[PDB]
Amino acid sequence: PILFGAAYYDEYIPRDLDRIDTDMEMMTRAGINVIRIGESTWSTCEPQPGHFDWTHIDRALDAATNAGINVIVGTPTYAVPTWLVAMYPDVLATTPAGEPHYGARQIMNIVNPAYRLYGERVIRSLISHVAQQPCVIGYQVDNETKYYDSVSHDMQVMFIKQLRHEFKNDLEALNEAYGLDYWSNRINAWEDFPDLTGSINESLRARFDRFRRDQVAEYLAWQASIIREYMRDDQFITHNFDYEWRGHSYGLQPAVDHFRAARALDICGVDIYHPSEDALTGKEIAFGGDMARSAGGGNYLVLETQAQGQHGWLPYPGQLRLQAYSHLASGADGIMYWHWHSIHNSFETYWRGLLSHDFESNPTYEEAGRFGREIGDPRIGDTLSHLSKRNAVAILASNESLTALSWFHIETGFPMGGTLTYNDVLRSIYDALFELNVEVDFLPADASADQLAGYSLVIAPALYTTDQQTIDRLARYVKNGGHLLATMRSFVADENVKVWHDKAPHHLVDIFGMTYNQFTRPMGVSLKCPDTLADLAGASANDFIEMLSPAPETHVLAWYDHYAWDSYAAITRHAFGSGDAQWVGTQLQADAWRTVLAEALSNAGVHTPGMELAGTVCVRSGTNTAGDTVTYLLNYSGSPITFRAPASGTFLLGHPVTAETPVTVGDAVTLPRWGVDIIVGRQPT
Amino acid sequence: PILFGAAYYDEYIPRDLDRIDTDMEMMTRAGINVIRIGESTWSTCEPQPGHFDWTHIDRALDAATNAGINVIVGTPTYAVPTWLVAMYPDVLATTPAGEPHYGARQIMNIVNPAYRLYGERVIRSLISHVAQQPCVIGYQVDNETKYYDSVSHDMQVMFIKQLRHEFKNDLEALNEAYGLDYWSNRINAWEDFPDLTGSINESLRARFDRFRRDQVAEYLAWQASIIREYMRDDQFITHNFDYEWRGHSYGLQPAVDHFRAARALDICGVDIYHPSEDALTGKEIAFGGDMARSAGGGNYLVLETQAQGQHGWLPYPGQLRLQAYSHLASGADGIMYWHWHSIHNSFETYWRGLLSHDFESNPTYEEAGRFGREIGDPRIGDTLSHLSKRNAVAILASNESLTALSWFHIETGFPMGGTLTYNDVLRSIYDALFELNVEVDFLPADASADQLAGYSLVIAPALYTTDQQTIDRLARYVKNGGHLLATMRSFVADENVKVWHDKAPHHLVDIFGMTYNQFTRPMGVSLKCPDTLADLAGASANDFIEMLSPAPETHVLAWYDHYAWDSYAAITRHAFGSGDAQWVGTQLQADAWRTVLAEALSNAGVHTPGMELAGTVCVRSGTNTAGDTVTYLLNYSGSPITFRAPASGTFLLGHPVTAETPVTVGDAVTLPRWGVDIIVGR
């Protein structure tokens, strides 16, 4: 059935209480069938070196067993004990800010041998101890693992050795690849290799970031490999990925390549956090879910999301339920809250769980339990689980480009100034599509020809650095009938972040039917659109403009409206083989992005039910394991709304209209504020 | 008489001058009867280790003696000589910023042995040298002393031993009290105890902060105890406390507990600086005076305030006078300027004294002298000194709550984000009261049953962390007839900053007649006020809202006006015993605070004639030593004002009306811009 649950910290509950069995009863009452334990408390289970105390782990396993609740056990390696650092200070990484100081979780040097050695021992002892317990259904490897800005000596030497291997000891080739002549930065003998911390060369720095991302992935695989020596055949290994953090889950994760790192896992997990209250839009849940579903090639677990949340996140009545159904609408096969309660000391005292600091019932917990009892009814649960999505549009995601542009800021070309980031461009586009009710998959930028070929529209947002093979695949995708749309600052540099030295866009001048070699930060530049984009006439060009020189054969969709720049296009499209290729040479406002992308989808022949409801209600859909269509209707607003049904079949939930009421496409539908219902393409049962 | 003076630095005066007797004469001309010397110049009086040179100290004592001026001697320990750090670099504290570098004052590790050894030596030599000089009337111990964010090894080890003592060596108890299971932070053996610098556990950090605050209090008591070995029976020990600095004196001092630290002294002293010119309000003078008066249980000395001041403080004509009288209206028994002149080199070149860089007369000095000759006339001096204030309202101050919310920000729960601080809440209440012409005392949060009992209204501004005993006193205070008003984020946590785990407000749900367990940052939330607070109707709820669930018998003064939260109250008041208890579950704008407080005060039976003049003129009063009522009328505006006299008696000063003109409550009164007079009820 659908996983529904919460992280539980027996280790944190005040010791003067004895309420574990009460907590378990509150959970089963709320339709909770799974808890997560163990990951944050190494110092409780191994209180002195070599001395293991499973009191708290056993208590949770026993209490869950007695309640009929399942358990996912997390390895406790993301936060280290006082006794470990006392013996080995280097467990804590040196960063660019200098020497570390004990306290915070996730400031360790993940390649430190004391960290790996003791880590391996607690992993072995914990997983050995719990693996045969029937309530344990799976494992979380570590927790939201990154490399934590480590520039420790060892990590650097290891990087130098990998550079030797990559370049077959040839420093002429390395210095040329990275342009290291500049500012007298050549490395002409391996023993002269400087400390990377002060490097001003982004070719080198990027490669080091990539190396360290790869170490994250290897560390996860290594942990998974250890759990594989103990686990039962009916258990799974997962991990809780997280996203760029801007007060909440925002964009592609800078420190980890989720596509690559997910290969060690049986199923992808993810943590998603987002604005609520008047600011609930659904966008972060959908973005988060689409990236997890894409990284894992199918259904994923939401291992953490918000209950009462941080200050400001407390959900209006109805919002918790609407947030939950949203996850299922992106294809989640589980939802778990972080966490069951609210902790009474220390950093996350006010990142609040289902229960408040009094451990009483409250309206948020009660709303959760109404949700849990809904999906725990098989009539609802069997209908919503394992949802399959077949999307026609893909967005290309690139950790290498995020890294590159974090240094060469789009607007300035330097690691200072500007406000537009890679994830801003990505989200500007993702969010426009969301506003139009068009659903997307994410693809890594090095996706195969077969993968690309599945999609009718492929979008490349500020896809700044790629290899030559990637360019060639995309040309071929277009030739064979695809539609490629790229934005400014794409295909600028090779995989070593060296800007190509032929005509831009590199090896795509004939595909896009244009070239450029000039750009600026626009002052009072707007757009003239003669035809297909007539609705865009007048829109502003923002942040950065590329002076696109269209070929004589190319269709210009927009020109700069400015006396210095009006010889140049802002937006072009050009046929090539059976497909076409569009470039957007500027950043657009949200309304302009919706205009451009709605036209592009129309050009590409992409239609989905709910497109007509854009701006009225959120519609997201899929096919269930009976092969029926499932259409969610999600009202992300504080007013009731009326609209016409986008599909025919039966209302699965009912809404303030009863469950199993039939509906026909076109029928009037009303949802209350923060309301939801779901049409399933079958008759009532 | 009233002390009136300035700090004087003969050590800093250009050496080509010989003007000390001219300075002294300009001082006596201006009614100045005391100077403060010695505290900033260790390297001048001990130029090489063990070699003392009292030339400058002697010059000042001889010149003062010759002019009939009294002297307060400061110990010079808050800035250290180059020769001391050259031997002992650990004199300078390690901070979370890392290694220190010599130059600034007040970057020492106040528990360092070299610092305390050489410090005891200079103290003993200086005090011994001056103690029997008739002009010396007292002593300042160090100067605005704090712990300077020291995380030096010794201070940490000392703290660990203090923890062993407090938990009786029981690390199981310590880990539970502080919740150190979280993020694998348990300390399971004493030898594993980590550096505190990078701790993310605010129960532990807050306790370290409290320890270091107590080390400041001890340091002050240690110096006072040395000084007591030499001083005459006719002399006093004091200290210049200071406030949270936000460009000027703003709020409760974060690094020192003035109520505790003040115990070692004969009389409290204070340094107060504030906006002037168009932004002169008198709020900071009154806040700082109320605090200092409260900390020491009576009259206090303003050991420093602004003369010409920093750039932007230069007072408009009339304002220096108005500022001065403002201090005496709060209960000051002395006013000293920092400082006499304007220094020609170095960091405070432009923190300017009475005289400018040219040492000439100027209008600010001349205004100060007109004021000093005023109070120097016993008709006025005698009437105004040792003022005694009996207030009906108390505000509870808590360093522990300041500390806790410096990390757990009201709005965010984290040490980043938000704008609303503990002191902002305290000042929001204080300022509304001042604007209502209501005078207050401060009490420490742990104030005794007897101290609480003396007040008709007690206000708990964001009293985030307390012990259980404080909560039980307060409940008894209400049961017995008191009126308690608490704001949001009060009584949340125990004295270890561990949030209580029963219903909130902890052991007070019966008293306030309400519980809450939900809160948020409000978006477009207003208040609905059905009766008693009808004037507040439509006011904004700001910064944070607690979802109060009132008992059936509780009076709901304000509900949330918002479709998500309108089941919940924002402001509640509940009868308990013969008193009552009111909770304001959000932050209010300034005008909303006046509306709320004016109603609470009326509920509590507090009314005076000055409250009728709120918004028009500042009225502050007390009783002088002949038993007469002294009523200040202070105009903190750039225009003239007209109003009805709030008391009968005689005008003391005269104003643009002669000195000693009679007046009767209700008589029309006019004051010029920045004006002042005083009605004395005889």
Side-chain angles (χ1 to χ4, degrees):
Chain A
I2 294 165
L3 294 180
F4 185 58
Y8 190 66
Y9 299 101
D10 184 56
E11 301 80 357
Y12 299 171
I13 295 191
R15 296 285 177 256
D16 61 288
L17 303 175
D18 178 20
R19 66 177 285 112
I20 197 157
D21 286 328
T22 297
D23 287 322
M24 302 300 98
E25 159 170 43
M26 290 178 88
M27 290 178 179
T28 56
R29 183 172 138 233
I32 285 168
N33 60 32
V34 72
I35 57 176
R36 195 190 66 179
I37 68 180
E39 98 291 341
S40 288
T41 50
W42 190 340
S43 75
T44 302
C45 73
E46 187 182 12
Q48 288 289 276
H51 292 287
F52 293 95
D53 184 345
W54 311 119
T55 300
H56 288 282
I57 288 290
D58 287 350
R59 281 166 47 76
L61 296 183
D62 287 0
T65 293
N66 179 69
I69 290 176
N70 300 127
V71 185
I72 293 164
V73 175
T75 62
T77 43
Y78 93 151
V80 301
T82 46
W83 55 256
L84 184 60
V85 307
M87 273 184 294
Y88 303 116
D90 291 343
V91 163
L92 307 185
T94 307
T95 76
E99 66 173 344
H101 294 93
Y102 183 85
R105 60 170 178 207
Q106 289 189 296
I107 58 173
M108 64 271 340
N109 181 20
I110 59 170
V111 301
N112 172 271
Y115 179 70
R116 300 292 275 264
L117 186 58
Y118 288 78
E120 181 169 357
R121 196 189 49 198
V122 68
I123 292 162
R124 296 189 180 274
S125 304
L126 173 67
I127 301 297
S128 188
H129 182 73
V130 305
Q132 296 296 330
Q133 304 312 120
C135 62
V136 170
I137 61 176
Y139 310 91
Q140 184 182 286
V141 162
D142 195 84
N143 187 106
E144 295 192 337
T145 313
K146 307 174 183 71
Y147 57 81
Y148 317 132
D149 287 344
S150 178
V151 302
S152 294
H153 180 69
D154 57 353
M155 181 73 81
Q156 300 199 46
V157 179
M158 288 166 188
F159 178 52
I160 290 165
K161 307 293 194 185
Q162 181 68 36
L163 288 178
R164 282 193 166 273
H165 173 89
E166 161 165 15
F167 286 96
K168 323 200 191 171
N169 306 310
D170 185 348
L171 286 162
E172 290 182 356
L174 181 163
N175 286 299
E176 176 59 15
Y178 302 162
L180 282 168
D181 296 271
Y182 175 84
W183 281 11
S184 181
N185 281 170
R186 290 186 75 97
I187 301 167
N188 297 318
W190 293 101
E191 70 283 4
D192 308 336
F193 205 109
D195 179 357
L196 286 168
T197 301
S199 188
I200 57 58
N201 189 304
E202 178 59 20
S203 301
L204 186 53
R205 296 178 68 85
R207 177 68 190 89
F208 186 46
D209 297 357
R210 171 176 149 223
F211 176 77
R212 294 187 284 173
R213 293 195 294 278
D214 290 350
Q215 295 293 316
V216 175
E218 182 281 332
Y219 177 39
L220 300 173
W222 170 80
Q223 290 216 22
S225 177
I226 294 165
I227 300 177
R228 283 181 180 113
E229 301 177 32
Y230 299 90
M231 60 188 312
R232 304 194 304 262
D233 294 340
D234 64 310
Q235 291 166 329
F236 60 91
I237 298 164
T238 187
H239 177 69
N240 56 335
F241 291 113
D242 65 334
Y243 298 113
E244 189 195 7
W245 192 259
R246 270 147 90 164
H248 64 261
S249 309
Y250 182 77
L252 201 71
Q253 172 48 240
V256 192
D257 183 328
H258 291 176
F259 293 96
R260 301 290 186 98
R263 296 174 171 160
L265 312 175
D266 295 317
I267 181 169
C268 290
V270 73
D271 298 347
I272 303 168
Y273 303 103
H274 54 83
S276 183
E277 302 193 358
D278 287 358
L280 178 58
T281 57
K283 276 160 178 178
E284 304 83 2
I285 294 166
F287 171 82
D290 293 325
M291 197 59 83
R293 192 186 66 253
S294 298
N299 303 105
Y300 58 97
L301 301 177
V302 170
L303 294 171
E304 305 173 16
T305 191
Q306 68 213 51
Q308 301 185 79
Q310 290 189 25
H311 286 359
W313 296 3
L314 179 74
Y316 291 160
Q319 293 190 312
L320 189 85
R321 185 184 178 233
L322 171 60
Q323 298 163 182
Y325 272 120
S326 301
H327 290 283
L328 299 185
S330 290
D333 260 347
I335 297 169
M336 299 174 63
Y337 295 101
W338 192 83
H339 58 105
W340 173 250
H341 79 282
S342 302
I343 300 160
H344 295 85
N345 302 85
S346 199
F347 189 66
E348 285 165 326
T349 288
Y350 293 115
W351 199 326
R352 299 193 305 129
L354 285 166
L355 318 182
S356 305
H357 289 96
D358 67 6
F359 297 100
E360 303 285 343
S361 177
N362 65 53
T364 306
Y365 161 74
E366 299 151 24
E367 182 169 332
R370 285 187 300 267
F371 176 80
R373 288 187 300 271
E374 280 173 281
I375 59 164
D377 186 341
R379 188 180 63 84
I380 299 185
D382 295 355
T383 299
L384 301 187
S385 64
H386 311 306
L387 184 76
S388 282
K389 262 127 132 60
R390 308 293 299 285
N391 290 324
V393 183
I395 301 175
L396 300 175
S398 170
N399 273 285
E400 289 179 51
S401 298
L402 181 160
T403 288
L405 294 174
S406 74
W407 182 273
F408 295 108
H409 293 172
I410 286 162
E411 297 161 85
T412 64
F414 291 97
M416 61 231 70
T419 64
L420 185 71
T421 62
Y422 172 84
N423 274 325
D424 295 336
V425 174
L426 181 67
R427 274 300 299 284
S428 75
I429 286 167
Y430 180 86
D431 288 1
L433 296 161
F434 182 90
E435 287 167 353
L436 298 171
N437 282 332
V438 175
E439 299 197 64
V440 306
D441 290 346
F442 287 96
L443 284 175
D446 66 351
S448 70
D450 282 356
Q451 297 174 280
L452 293 158
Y455 298 90
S456 293
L457 179 65
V458 172
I459 304 182
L463 180 43
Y464 184 85
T465 169
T466 73
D467 63 16
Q468 165 79 250
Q469 298 93 300
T470 286
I471 283 165
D472 292 341
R473 286 183 292 257
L474 290 171
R476 171 64 62 178
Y477 161 77
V478 177
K479 199 182 180 219
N480 289 341
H483 304 265
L484 175 69
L485 189 163
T487 68
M488 64 170 182
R489 260 55 297 259
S490 301
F491 310 109
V492 178
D494 71 17
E495 72 282 7
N496 301 316
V497 203
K498 182 176 193 156
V499 173
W500 307 104
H501 55 266
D502 65 350
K503 281 170 181 193
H506 177 87
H507 289 197
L508 288 168
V509 163
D510 286 345
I511 283 77
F512 290 103
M514 73 87 183
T515 183
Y516 76 97
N517 68 3
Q518 303 204 302
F519 30 73
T520 198
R521 304 177 69 171
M523 342 179 66
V525 181
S526 78
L527 295 188
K528 294 198 228 76
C529 308
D531 63 330
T532 327
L533 288 184
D535 284 339
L536 192 68
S540 62
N542 308 274
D543 298 328
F544 196 81
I545 57 170
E546 292 167 340
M547 305 307 172
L548 310 184
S549 276
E553 302 78 13
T554 289
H555 180 203
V556 177
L557 291 63
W559 295 89
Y560 297 112
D561 181 0
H562 190 287
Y563 74 82
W565 311 135
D566 61 21
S567 302
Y568 301 104
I571 305 173
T572 54
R573 186 153 62 212
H574 170 266
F576 179 79
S578 309
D580 67 36
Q582 185 171 348
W583 195 273
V584 182
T586 193
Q587 180 65 332
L588 300 175
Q589 316 229 88
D591 55 2
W593 266 124
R594 290 195 298 275
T595 299
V596 170
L597 293 155
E599 196 280 338
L601 298 149
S602 198
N603 188 56
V606 172
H607 175 275
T608 188
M611 279 185 210
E612 75 288 2
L613 293 171
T616 294
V617 61
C618 173
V619 171
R620 287 177 61 79
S621 66
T623 300
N624 66 19
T625 61
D628 300 333
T629 309
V630 179
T631 311
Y632 289 72
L633 317 170
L634 301 154
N635 177 22
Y636 297 115
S637 75
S639 299
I641 56 168
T642 302
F643 54 88
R644 316 186 50 195
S648 293
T650 301
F651 284 117
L652 185 67
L653 305 185
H655 57 273
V657 168
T658 74
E660 301 289 329
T661 302
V663 64
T664 295
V665 61
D667 291 353
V669 188
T670 294
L671 290 172
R673 58 157 64 104
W674 313 115
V676 47
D677 208 338
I678 307 177
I679 304 166
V680 197
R682 57 139 179 86
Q683 309 204 353
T685 59
Chain B
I2 299 159
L3 284 185
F4 186 60
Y8 190 69
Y9 303 102
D10 185 59
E11 300 83 359
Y12 299 169
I13 308 291
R15 239 72 145 188
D16 56 293
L17 305 176
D18 191 4
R19 69 161 287 110
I20 188 159
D21 292 321
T22 304
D23 288 326
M24 288 310 85
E25 195 177 18
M26 291 168 80
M27 284 173 195
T28 50
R29 165 166 314 110
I32 286 176
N33 59 35
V34 60
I35 61 187
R36 190 192 67 184
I37 67 181
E39 83 303 337
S40 285
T41 53
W42 191 344
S43 66
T44 305
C45 69
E46 193 179 0
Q48 289 286 276
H51 295 261
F52 294 98
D53 186 342
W54 308 116
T55 308
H56 294 279
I57 286 293
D58 293 347
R59 286 171 38 80
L61 300 188
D62 291 354
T65 294
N66 173 260
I69 287 168
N70 294 129
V71 176
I72 296 158
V73 181
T75 61
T77 44
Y78 92 153
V80 297
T82 49
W83 56 252
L84 177 61
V85 310
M87 275 192 299
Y88 300 119
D90 290 344
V91 171
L92 308 186
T94 302
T95 76
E99 173 219 314
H101 296 85
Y102 179 82
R105 71 165 179 207
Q106 292 187 295
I107 62 169
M108 62 267 346
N109 181 27
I110 62 170
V111 304
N112 172 266
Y115 180 60
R116 299 293 272 267
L117 186 64
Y118 282 88
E120 177 175 355
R121 190 175 67 193
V122 72
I123 293 160
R124 286 185 186 284
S125 313
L126 173 69
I127 298 296
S128 181
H129 183 74
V130 305
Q132 296 307 323
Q133 289 295 118
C135 59
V136 175
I137 61 178
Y139 308 95
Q140 178 183 282
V141 165
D142 201 79
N143 185 104
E144 301 183 338
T145 315
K146 309 173 184 63
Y147 60 83
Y148 321 134
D149 292 308
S150 179
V151 298
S152 293
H153 173 69
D154 59 353
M155 176 87 73
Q156 294 203 45
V157 173
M158 283 168 186
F159 178 59
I160 291 153
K161 308 282 193 195
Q162 185 64 28
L163 293 174
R164 280 198 161 264
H165 170 84
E166 305 215 308
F167 288 95
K168 304 159 86 83
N169 286 347
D170 183 349
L171 287 167
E172 300 192 346
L174 183 164
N175 279 310
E176 173 63 19
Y178 296 169
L180 284 165
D181 295 80
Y182 171 83
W183 281 12
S184 185
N185 273 172
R186 291 183 73 97
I187 307 165
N188 298 316
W190 293 98
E191 71 277 8
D192 296 345
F193 206 106
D195 188 346
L196 282 150
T197 297
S199 188
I200 51 71
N201 180 306
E202 178 62 13
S203 295
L204 185 61
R205 298 176 70 83
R207 181 69 189 90
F208 183 52
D209 289 8
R210 178 166 150 240
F211 181 70
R212 294 181 292 169
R213 291 199 292 281
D214 296 344
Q215 291 295 325
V216 174
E218 187 284 333
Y219 183 35
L220 298 182
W222 177 77
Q223 289 218 17
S225 167
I226 298 164
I227 290 174
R228 291 189 204 283
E229 296 169 42
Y230 307 88
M231 64 189 301
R232 311 188 304 255
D233 290 335
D234 62 353
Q235 284 168 339
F236 61 87
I237 293 155
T238 187
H239 181 74
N240 54 337
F241 292 114
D242 68 337
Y243 299 111
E244 186 188 18
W245 188 256
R246 270 147 90 165
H248 63 264
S249 305
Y250 184 70
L252 202 68
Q253 175 49 238
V256 186
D257 180 328
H258 290 174
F259 290 96
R260 303 291 175 75
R263 292 178 191 158
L265 305 183
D266 298 320
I267 182 164
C268 286
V270 73
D271 301 339
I272 298 170
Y273 304 102
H274 55 81
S276 189
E277 300 189 3
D278 289 0
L280 181 60
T281 67
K283 289 164 166 167
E284 296 85 12
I285 290 172
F287 167 87
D290 286 343
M291 194 70 67
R293 191 186 64 255
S294 302
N299 303 110
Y300 58 95
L301 306 177
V302 175
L303 287 175
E304 300 178 16
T305 192
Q306 66 215 56
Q308 296 187 83
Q310 291 182 24
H311 288 350
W313 300 356
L314 188 72
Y316 294 158
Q319 288 186 317
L320 187 73
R321 194 190 185 223
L322 176 61
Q323 290 159 11
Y325 272 115
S326 292
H327 286 288
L328 308 172
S330 279
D333 262 354
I335 296 171
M336 296 176 77
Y337 292 100
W338 198 85
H339 59 107
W340 177 241
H341 79 278
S342 294
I343 295 152
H344 293 91
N345 303 93
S346 208
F347 189 67
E348 282 170 330
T349 292
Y350 291 113
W351 195 328
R352 300 195 303 132
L354 284 171
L355 306 190
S356 296
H357 285 101
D358 58 17
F359 291 101
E360 295 291 341
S361 181
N362 67 51
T364 301
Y365 163 70
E366 283 150 33
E367 186 176 327
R370 286 194 297 274
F371 173 87
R373 285 190 304 272
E374 267 178 287
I375 56 158
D377 179 359
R379 193 180 61 86
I380 297 166
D382 290 350
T383 307
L384 291 190
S385 56
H386 312 314
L387 187 79
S388 162
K389 296 193 160 257
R390 309 278 309 251
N391 293 321
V393 179
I395 298 174
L396 296 178
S398 171
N399 274 98
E400 290 172 296
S401 299
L402 189 159
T403 286
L405 294 178
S406 83
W407 183 277
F408 296 111
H409 289 182
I410 294 163
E411 290 171 276
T412 66
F414 292 103
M416 44 271 342
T419 55
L420 188 73
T421 70
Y422 172 87
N423 276 327
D424 287 331
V425 177
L426 178 72
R427 289 287 309 275
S428 75
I429 300 301
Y430 186 85
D431 287 10
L433 299 169
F434 180 95
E435 281 161 7
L436 291 174
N437 274 337
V438 177
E439 298 199 66
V440 301
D441 296 332
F442 285 101
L443 291 173
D446 70 343
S448 67
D450 280 356
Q451 296 178 286
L452 296 161
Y455 296 97
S456 299
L457 177 67
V458 175
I459 302 167
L463 181 50
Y464 181 94
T465 167
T466 74
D467 60 21
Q468 175 79 68
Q469 293 96 310
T470 291
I471 283 174
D472 294 338
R473 286 183 292 256
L474 287 178
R476 197 166 303 119
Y477 166 79
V478 172
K479 189 174 67 55
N480 299 335
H483 298 277
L484 177 65
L485 191 161
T487 64
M488 66 169 181
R489 259 56 292 273
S490 283
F491 310 115
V492 174
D494 75 11
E495 65 280 8
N496 300 323
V497 202
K498 182 169 183 152
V499 179
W500 302 112
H501 57 273
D502 57 352
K503 294 183 186 174
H506 175 79
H507 288 188
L508 289 161
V509 165
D510 291 339
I511 304 333
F512 287 93
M514 75 84 170
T515 186
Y516 77 94
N517 66 6
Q518 292 200 316
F519 30 74
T520 201
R521 298 176 74 170
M523 310 168 82
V525 187
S526 272
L527 304 177
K528 275 183 325 185
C529 301
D531 42 53
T532 302
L533 285 187
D535 288 5
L536 186 59
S540 59
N542 301 273
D543 300 332
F544 193 81
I545 57 173
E546 291 169 337
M547 298 318 161
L548 320 181
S549 307
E553 78 271 19
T554 291
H555 186 188
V556 179
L557 283 64
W559 298 93
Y560 291 120
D561 185 357
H562 193 286
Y563 72 87
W565 311 134
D566 59 15
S567 289
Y568 300 102
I571 305 188
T572 54
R573 187 162 58 215
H574 183 252
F576 189 79
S578 49
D580 57 38
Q582 176 162 6
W583 194 281
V584 181
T586 190
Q587 176 64 330
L588 302 165
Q589 276 161 222
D591 55 348
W593 268 121
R594 300 189 290 275
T595 293
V596 175
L597 294 164
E599 194 279 339
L601 288 160
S602 184
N603 184 68
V606 181
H607 191 83
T608 68
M611 294 174 60
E612 319 285 40
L613 298 179
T616 288
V617 60
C618 176
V619 178
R620 286 177 60 86
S621 59
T623 297
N624 66 20
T625 52
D628 283 331
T629 305
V630 180
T631 302
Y632 289 81
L633 310 177
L634 302 149
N635 179 26
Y636 295 119
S637 73
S639 314
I641 52 170
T642 290
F643 57 91
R644 312 283 293 288
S648 299
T650 294
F651 281 117
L652 188 65
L653 305 190
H655 64 274
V657 179
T658 59
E660 300 292 338
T661 302
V663 61
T664 303
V665 51
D667 286 356
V669 187
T670 268
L671 286 174
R673 68 159 52 115
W674 311 114
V676 56
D677 216 328
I678 304 172
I679 293 164
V680 195
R682 68 203 184 197

